[PDB]
Design a protein around this ligand. Structure first.
Ligand code: CHL
Ligand code: CHL
Ligand code: CLA
Ligand code: CLA
Ligand code: CLA
Ligand code: CLA
Ligand code: CLA
Ligand SMILES: CCCCCCCCCCCCCCCC(=O)OC[C@H](COP(=O)(O)OC[C@@H](O)CO)OC(=O)CCCCCCCCCCCCCCC
Ligand SMILES: CC(/C=C/C=C(C)/C=C/[C@@]12O[C@]1(C)C[C@@H](O)CC2(C)C)=C\C=C\C=C(C)\C=C\C=C(C)\C=C\[C@@]12O[C@]1(C)C[C@@H](O)CC2(C)C
Ligand SMILES: CC1=C[C@H](O)CC(C)(C)[C@H]1/C=C/C(C)=C/C=C/C(C)=C/C=C/C=C(C)/C=C/C=C(C)/C=C/C1=C(C)C[C@H](O)CC1(C)C
Ligand SMILES: CC1=C(C/C=C(\C)CCC[C@H](C)CCC[C@H](C)CCCC(C)C)C(=O)c2ccccc2C1=O
Ligand code: SF4
Lengths: 742, 222, 42, 203
């Protein structure tokens, strides 16, 4: 059945191994042969799979390790709440959120660096933040420095709880294997307990605290006089003075007269004109609706009583003619291998983060988030990068599974077999498309640029010339605009304001949203994204399929997951290891994402954001030039890189100086990485030797013999810096630009 | 051996030798296959009897002071429903010889001596009658059963004088009473949230008017 | 006790302790003799 | 072995065996797990036992006697700020030298027992103590009182540590009380005597 059998004191808490570096691995433990040793110490620190050969210990280590990862997050949260309480103009920000920048960092004045303390207003100074906590603390009705302090302590305590918990469950009472593999109950609790009861509890706090309090601040009152949140929960008559449905108590909920709670549980849609965010009634309803759906879904898989499904039997009924044995056997290979689960989870959590970034800019959920141009740009950019990386990780661990855990004599699967057998078709067809999109997406930009350069602006691809109208997006925009009429009679308005119809929402002389048009200039760039996404898929997919064998090397599996090459024979076999396919994917992931966050930044400044006249005419930040200048490659140079880098470049001598330095500093690191990617090891090894000789002359030759980095480390350092230089350069480019213009 | 809502798992280990047994256990807890901490069938039994005993004096104090305020010679000042005695300030309080939070720490220290020593005898039988404790060591060794230490300080006259059946009969009475009190205290609470007029009053509300039946009403007030 | 001291003697732990002390020292000197473009004692 | 333990019924650590005066088997973290650190730490606890004993005498006795009207001593808390016959700095400097002399020689005895006990000037002034940390001699035992049988010194030394531990808590008592209460230690005693159940940390 399903029970809790654990062990007692597997590994004794002691400090011995803390003074025996490289104890975990048998190879590393003998000592530092050369400096190659101190690099292999960290490269194999967390690879629990290579230390031991059984699933039980690997499990207990990953289970306890997560507790550490969970603990750090709490400590990270604790600082953010603490800092917002002791070093912020939050309470001032609650008075005029429209035109006082959120600041929650203050620097010590040592070497003149107090120039960084910007005049964010509100009688305060400091680094203007952009993570947008302030809109999060207002949407939860905090309205006090004291309440930000107590949660900071509460957040800190849990960190000690988690960190303690990690210790307890690896040294004192560690679970057994049978505990881990019972994945029906695993899903059963997470769906009902974590996901389900998480929302319902939160839908609680919104009903009794965030809603009635924020309804005071939105109504307009000084924060200091809002009765404390435990007054409503005690004095039930106060909730009556706003929400008369709270007189009858919770009995309508029990008599199915649910249309009595219509005051604070609605289906409005749209955005709030006062605060530019969603209607907290909808949000209040939303988590409640989600709560029920998850909770019921929790009760599906059989755990201990008669009722419930069997995850094994579900996978063993779907087998088709084209597919053969179908999903039989996938239960094992998804249960006796952590690298399978980590690869599968990474892709979904990777994808979801992206969808988060597409929704949070079009349905602004927190109050006074819409007119916070510094926040919108950062939050959209941040989760794109997070979403991009995690997807690449799903390729690496899927590739690792093919090399280490896959075995067609015991863990045999049929679908994963058929997929292997026709892999030549899969890559070649994906190869042709990546070429097709390559010619018809970039080429149109090149042809546009050539014709424009020759004085033929009537042969370019644009709205004023040969036209390419996205109709399919223009059609679906139409449908969502008229959905409130027929196909969703409950809704008062559309689910957003970017649908091809409606009206803008103005908050304090700053546009929240308005219908986003889709002309030709948008059609091209959407087919750029379809191109770089496909190419990135090609590299990672090729790595996963060919991680065990190919027509070049027939025994690549025997060489492991990350090996440099197989020598210069057969024409040259540099970079055939699956690790080097993900190594290549990173650049395209860095390429796909970068154009997306360029596309978002220009489209919103040119077509959406911007001030609004008192009369009613709207003037966007860049004057609406995206629809004409974004179709020529030179256009992306003049009017985006050259014209929107002005603020970062001349940011010297004012609080935005720290961005001016990072802008340069990130170039230096980017250009630095090239030394590792372009060159090779055998040159650096020899130059090291001559340097080593001079130290022999003066007797200062070390005993950990100097060595050059290993082949796959020269690449690993090469890509890491390149990514760090590329991402940070955009970081300093964006924040300094948007903070100055809005 | 009367069984109530038994289960195949339950009757593999609930042998009935433990007093208060009725073979009721559908959540895998007392299962002896899985024993880390706090899931030992002894410890759970140890926590079962203690919680009951705390309930057996917790319940009576949860209805004594107001009901004794119904006729008794208690001056009405210290005759109050239990939740307004001072435990829950938002329900009310009363000014005792102290001011609160000094009563707490005093209480937590006095409890600390009895509690921790009460814990050690579970870890190390007979240990608490070895180191010097101002005399009294002759008793604090216990009889070897942590839940039933015995001794002239704990079992002064001595019942269960000599009869295991009686003791088994007695301990059966001790748990079923314990279960009765735990549920009862859970009654005095959930009544308070909904009724909000005090425990013993809420029995009169159903006495003078059985048609009250606050279930159907479900009005909430402090 | 011996094992704790040995661990505290491994290279990375000394580095942060050593450099941290060095950072504190330089910051203090710049707090007391700021701008310091020349060495005007002799 | 069967000596009283801080936590009765617990198993004391092996390196604590009751030999040393004041060994109630208390070392949860094992700071004295290895013999050498124990040896040094024994000294550390010993001297800390003597300083606070004077400090407890230094704080409580004058504040007591000034609370009643017999004298004029101010608060120990602001005792440093007071201006005496010269600047504080030089007196501290003078304190640096002279203490460094004893804290120098004491240091030599610690690292090398028995190599410091003879007077550098008048060599017939040799000190009599044999145990590290117990100098003996006519300067520090004007009548002996340390040269006795065991089970008496062990009693006496335990009467020296057990008081010292009582001091170190008390002076840190006078420390934190002066910070979050506004008055001297004796007031914190009396205001706790008028309403013991009300006037505490919880104001
Ligand atoms: C100085 C360090 C020291 C500390 C932190 C403690 C604290 C403790 N002593 Mg302890 N003792 C200490 C030293 C000593 N004790 C004792 C004599 C006792 C006795 C007799 C008892 C304790 C008990 C306790 C425990 C319960 C106290 C409590 O409930 O708090 C609120 C706790 C571990 C109690 C205990 O351990 O019960 C299991 C208990 O009965 N102590 C002696 C003299 C022998 C000590 C000498 O240093
Ligand atoms: C040991 C020792 C201890 C525990 C103290 C403690 C103190 N001294 Mg003191 N001193 C000590 C040795 C010495 N002091 C001084 C000279 C001074 C001065 C001039 C001052 C102090 C002050 C202080 C106070 C600082 C307040 C604080 O710590 O905020 C937490 C505190 C009561 C300050 C004070 O009195 O503020 C009220 C102060 O101005 N001390 C000398 C040189 C003779 C010492 C030699 O050992
Ligand atoms: C929470 C997600 C997660 C988890 C648990 C892991 C866990 C692991 N990864 Mg992995 N990975 C992830 C996300 C994750 N990764 C993502 C998002 C990517 C894409 C960038 C990768 C790319 C990746 C590669 C390419 C490799 C691993 C490897 C490993 C294993 C050894 C890691 C190690 O020793 O590094 C120790 C930690 C460091 C060296 C710190 C680096 C400092 C950075 C650069 C700053 C370990 C099981 C290795 C492996 O299993 O080989 C068998 C391996 O080769 N991962
Ligand atoms: C600016 C630099 C650059 C360019 C142009 C390319 C171009 C290409 N790379 Mg690539 N790559 C680069 C940098 C670049 N890479 C870097 C730095 C890396 C390291 C990370 C990689 C890593 C990499 C990998 C790993 C892969 C590619 C792939 C591809 C090809 C897919 C795109 C395609 O088919 O479009 C078609 C070609 C173009 C759009 C180029 C412009 C052509 C224009 C439209 C017209 C050209 C003139 C015309 C022919 C007239 C001829 C004139 C006559 C006189 C001759 C393409 C050839 C993928 C591939 O080949 O598989 C599909 C692939 O798997 N590259
Ligand atoms: C296929 C597209 C589509 C989608 C996504 C929705 C979506 C929704 N419909 Mg819907 N609906 C559709 C087509 C669709 N409808 C069509 C073609 C009809 C026939 C006229 C309806 C008739 C309909 C009714 C009658 C109702 C909904 C309702 C709803 C909501 C529940 C949800 C927003 C309900 C609603 O108003 O939700 C608030 C509701 O009462 N729908
Ligand atoms: C992350 C979720 C999680 C999960 C799945 C478990 C799971 C379990 N815990 Mg546990 N535990 C957790 C968090 C968790 N714990 C935390 C955060 C703490 C610190 C408060 C503890 C403290 C704790 C104790 C003190 C005990 C357990 C016990 C148990 C087992 C019953 C079971 C294996 C009990 C057991 O039988 O030991 C394994 C037990 O004695 N856990
Ligand atoms: C563990 C059980 C428990 C707990 C926590 C309490 C708690 C309390 N009782 Mg109580 N009580 C209990 C059992 C309990 N009672 C039982 C079993 C009886 C019947 C024998 C009583 C009879 C009783 C009376 C008659 C009074 C209290 C009172 C009180 C309050 C002051 C403390 C006290 O008694 O002063 C110690 C009293 C001494 C005489 C000594 C406090 C809320 C007083 C009060 O105001 O009621 C709220 C009060 O006058 N109790
Ligand atoms: C046009 C091709 C339609 C493709 C289509 O509709 O597939 C449908 C086809 C259905 O397979 P079965 O019905 O035999 O599989 C039943 C499933 O439950 C798994 O057994 O899937 C395939 O055979 C793989 C084809 C992938 C082709 C991917 C192209 C991109
Ligand atoms: C409390 C203290 C040290 C306490 C140490 C503790 C608890 C450690 C406990 C543990 O390690 C063990 C035991 C075992 C581990 O396994 C467990 C833990 C728990 C980790 C030192 C105080 C030590 C206190 C001292 C030394 C006090 C000295 C007083 C002095 C010097 C005099 C000061 C004055 O001169 C001024 C300043 C001003 C004048 O006006 C007034 C006077 C008073 C005259
Ligand atoms: C068995 C099983 C098995 C399966 O498998 C599953 C399931 C079924 C789930 C399970 C079940 C379980 C259960 C039911 C349990 C319960 C318990 C309880 C209730 C306890 C209480 C318990 C309770 C208790 C102790 C209580 C106590 C109390 C007290 C002291 C009181 C006190 C007081 C008073 C007087 C007055 C003042 O002024 C206040 C106060 C202070 C407040
Ligand atoms: C530059 C370069 C090197 C040389 C880089 C080396 C040898 C490592 C860089 C030196 C590091 C920083 C060691 C210095 C840190 C030591 C621990 C000493 C610390 C002392 C400091 C506190 C001063 C390679 O080894 C290499 C290998 C493969 C492909 C490309 C390259 C490559 O491009
Ligand atoms: S160049 Fe390097 S990677 Fe390529 S074959 Fe030679 S050794 Fe291998």
């Amino acid at each position: 059945e399903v029970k809790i059998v654990v062990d007692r004191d597997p590994v004794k808490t002691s400090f011995e191994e803390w003074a025996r570096p490289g104890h975990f691995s048998r190879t590393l433990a003998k000592g530092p042969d050369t400096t190659t040793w101190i690099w292999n110490l960290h490269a194999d620190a967390h690879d629990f799979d290579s230390h031991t050969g059984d699933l039980e210990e690997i499990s207990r280590k990953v289970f306890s390790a997560h507790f550490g990862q969970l603990s750090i997050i709490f400590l990270w949260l604790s600082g953010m709440y603490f800092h917002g309480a002791r070093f912020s103009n939050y309470e001032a920000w609650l008075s005029d959120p429209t035109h006082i920048g959120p600041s929650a960092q203050v620097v010590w004045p040592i070497v003149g660096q107090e120039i960084l303390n910007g005049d964010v207003g509100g009688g305060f100074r400091g680094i203007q933040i952009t993570s947008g906590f302030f809109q999060l603390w207002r949407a939860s009705g905090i309205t006090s420095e004291l309440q930000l302090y107590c949660t900071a302590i509460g957040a800190l305590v849990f960190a000690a709880l988690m960190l303690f918990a990690g210790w307890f469950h690896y040294h004192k009472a560690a679970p057994k294997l049978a505990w881990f593999q019972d994945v029906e109950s695993m899903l059963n609790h997470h769906l009902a307990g974590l996901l389900g009861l998480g929302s319902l509890s939160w839908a609680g706090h919104q009903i009794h605290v965030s809603l009635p309090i924020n309804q005071f601040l939105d109504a307009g009152v000084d924060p200091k006089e809002i009765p404390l949140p435990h007054e409503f929960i005690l004095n039930r008559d106060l909730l009556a003075q706003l929400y008369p449905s709270f007189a009858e108590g919770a009995t309508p909920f029990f008599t199915l007269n649910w249309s009595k709670y219509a005051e604070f549980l609605t289906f409005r849609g749209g955005l709030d004109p006062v605060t530019g965010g969603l209607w907290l009634t909808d949000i209040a309803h939303h988590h409640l609706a989600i709560a029920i759906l998850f909770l019921i879904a929790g009760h599906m898989y059989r755990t201990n009583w008669g009722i419930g499904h069997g995850l094994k039997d579900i996978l063993e009924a779907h087998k088709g003619p084209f597919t053969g044995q179908g999903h039989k056997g996938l239960y094992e290979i998804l249960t006796t291998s952590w690298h399978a689960q980590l690869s599968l989870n990474l892709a979904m959590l990777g994808s979801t983060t992206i969808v988060v970034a597409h929704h949070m800019y079009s349905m602004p959920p927190y109050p006074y988030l819409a007119t916070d141009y510094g926040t919108q740009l950062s939050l959209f950019t941040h989760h794109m990068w997070i979403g991009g990386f995690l997807i690449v990780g799903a390729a690496a661990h899927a590739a690792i599974f093919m090399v280490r855990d896959y075995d067609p004599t015991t863990r045999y699967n049929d679908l994963l077999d058929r997929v292997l057998r026709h892999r030549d078709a899969i890559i070649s067809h994906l190869n042709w498309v990546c070429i097709f999109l390559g010619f018809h997406s970039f080429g149109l930009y090149i042809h546009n640029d050539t014709m424009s350069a020759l004085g033929r602006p009537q042969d370019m691809f644009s709205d004023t010339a040969i036209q390419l109208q996205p109709i399919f997006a223009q059609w679906v925009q139409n449908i969502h605009a008229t959905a409130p009429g027929v196909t969703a009679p409950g809704a008062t308005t559309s689910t957003s304001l970017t649908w091809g119809g409606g009206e803008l929402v103005a908050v304090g002389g700053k546009v929240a949203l308005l219908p986003i048009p889709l002309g030709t200039a948008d059609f091209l760039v959407h087919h750029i994204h379809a191109f770089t996404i496909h190419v990135t898929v090609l590299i990672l997919l090729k790595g996963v399929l060919f991680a065990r064998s190919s027509r070049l090397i027939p025994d690549k599996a025997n060489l492991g997951f990350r090996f440099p090459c197989d020598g210069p024979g057969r024409g040259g076999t540099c970079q055939v290891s699956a690790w080097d396919h993900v190594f290549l994917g990173l650049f395209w992931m860095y390429n796909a994402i970068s154009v997306v966050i360029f596309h978002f930044s220009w489209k919103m400044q040119s077509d959406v954001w911007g001030t609004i006249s008192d009369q009613g005419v709207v003037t966007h930040i860049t004057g609406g030039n995206f629809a004409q200048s974004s179709i020529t490659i030179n256009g992306w140079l003049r009017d985006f890189l050259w014209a929107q880098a002005s603020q970062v470049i001349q940011s010297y001598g004012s609080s935005l100086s720290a961005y001016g330095l990072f802008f340069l500093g990130a170039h230096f690191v980017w250009a630095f990485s090239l030394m590792f990617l372009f060159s090779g090891r055998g040159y650096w090894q020899e130059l090291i030797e001559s340097i080593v000789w001079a130290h022999n002359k003066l007797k200062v030759a070390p005993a950990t013999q100097p060595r050059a980095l290993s082949i796959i480390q020269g690449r690993a350092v090469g890509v890491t810096h390149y990514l760090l230089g590329g991402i940070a350069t955009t970081w300093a480019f964006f924040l300094a630009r948007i903070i100055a213009v809005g | 051996r009367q069984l109530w809502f038994a289960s195949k798992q339950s009757l593999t280990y609930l042998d009935g030798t433990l007093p208060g047994d009725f073979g009721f256990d559908p959540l895998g807890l007392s299962d002896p296959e899985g024993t880390g901490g706090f899931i030992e069938p002894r410890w759970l039994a140890y926590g079962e009897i203690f919680n009951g005993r705390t309930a057996m004096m917790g319940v009576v104090g949860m209805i004594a002071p107001e009901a004794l305020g119904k006729v008794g010679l208690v001056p009405p000042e210290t005759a109050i429903p239990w939740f307004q005695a001072g435990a829950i300030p938002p329900a009310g309080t009363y000014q005792y010889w102290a001011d609160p939070y000094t009563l707490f720490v005093f209480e937590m220290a006095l409890i600390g001596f009895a509690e921790h020593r009460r814990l050690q005898d579970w870890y190390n039988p007979g240990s608490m009658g070895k180191q010097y404790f101002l005399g009294l060591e002759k008793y604090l060794g216990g009889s070897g059963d942590p839940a039933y230490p015995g001794g002239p300080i704990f079992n002064p006259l001595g019942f269960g004088t000599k009869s295991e059946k009686e003791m088994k009969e007695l301990k059966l009475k001790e748990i079923k009473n314990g279960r009765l009190a735990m549920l009862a205290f859970l009654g005095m609470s959930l009544q308070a949230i909904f009724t909000g007029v005090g425990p013993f009053q809420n029995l009169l509300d159903h006495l003078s008017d059985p048609v009250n039946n606050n279930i159907l009403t479900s009005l909430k007030f402090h | 006790m011996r094992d704790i001291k040995t661990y505290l003697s491994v290279a990375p732990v000394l580095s942060t302790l050593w450099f941290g002390a060095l950072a504190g020292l330089l910051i203090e000197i710049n707090r007391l003799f700021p701008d310091a473009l020349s060495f005007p004692f002799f | 072995p069967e000596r009283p333990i801080w936590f009765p019924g617990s198993t004391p650590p092996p390196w604590l065996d009751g030999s040393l005066p004041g060994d109630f088997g208390f070392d949860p973290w094992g700071l004295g797990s290895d013999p050498e650190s124990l040896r040094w730490n024994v000294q550390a606890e010993l001297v800390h036992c003597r300083w606070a004993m004077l400090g407890a005498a230094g704080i409580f006795i004058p504040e007591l006697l000034t609370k009643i009207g017999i004298l004029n001593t101010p608060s120990w808390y602001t005792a440093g700020e007071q201006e005496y016959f010269t600047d504080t700095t030089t007196l501290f400097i003078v304190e640096l030298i002279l203490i460094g002399w004893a804290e120098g020689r004491r240091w030599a005895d610690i690292i090398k027992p028995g190599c410091v006990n003879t007077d550098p000037i008048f060599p017939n002034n040799k000190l009599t103590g044999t145990d590290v940390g117990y100098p003996g001699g006519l300067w520090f035992d004007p009548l002996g009182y340390g040269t006795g049988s065991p089970e008496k010194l062990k009693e006496l030394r335990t009467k020296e540590i057990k008081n010292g531990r009582l001091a170190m808590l008390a002076v840190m008592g006078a420390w934190f009380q002066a910070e979050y209460t506004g008055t001297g230690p004796i007031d914190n005693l009396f205001a706790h005597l008028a309403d013991p159940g009300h006037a505490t940390i919880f104001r």
